[PDB]
Amino acid sequence: MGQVGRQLAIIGDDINRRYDSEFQTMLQHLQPTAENAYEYFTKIATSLFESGINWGRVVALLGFGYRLALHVYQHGGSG
């Protein structure tokens, strides 16, 4: 079977189609700096693991940790 990647790309594209734009703006209204990015991260994770901890939420949090770091580096300094 070779469609696994093609199906992952489809699955991944559906996620990007309806969340990415939403995430781009929320992060912008967060205005994260290098000083308070982690505090926001801790508060986000706490409310995320509030209703339970499954692997997908763990994965989404770790992925969000990296995207938030990339956002800080790019749009930091209170942009």
């Binding site: 070779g2 469609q3 790309a9 996620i15 706490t46 409310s47 995320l48 994965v59 770790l62």
Partner: protein, 80 residues
């Protein structure tokens, strides 16, 4: 904010939906099972090359691939 904030609640609850959606995707769960830990890495690199074969790139694909990769790791870590 500074420790609290509205948007933290919007981002967290948005992270709930993506994570629960990944664990609730039955085609994704079947794809994990369909794989074999005879050569694990090679399965991942053939899937990653097939995934980015169309030349497109976005964050949704990052999460999908990362979830698939880690579930693949969990399987091998507790299944052979």
């Amino acid at each position: 904010g500074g420790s609290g904030d509205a948007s933290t609640k919007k981002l967290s609850e948005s992270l709930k939906r993506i994570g629960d959606e990944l664990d609730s995707n039955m085609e994704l769960q079947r794809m994990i099972a369909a794989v074999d830990t005879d050569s694990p890495r090679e399965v991942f690199f053939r899937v990653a090359a097939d995934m980015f074969s169309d030349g497109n790139f976005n964050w949704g694909r990052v999460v999908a691939l990362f979830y698939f990769a880690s579930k693949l790791v969990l399987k091998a870590l507790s299944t052979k």
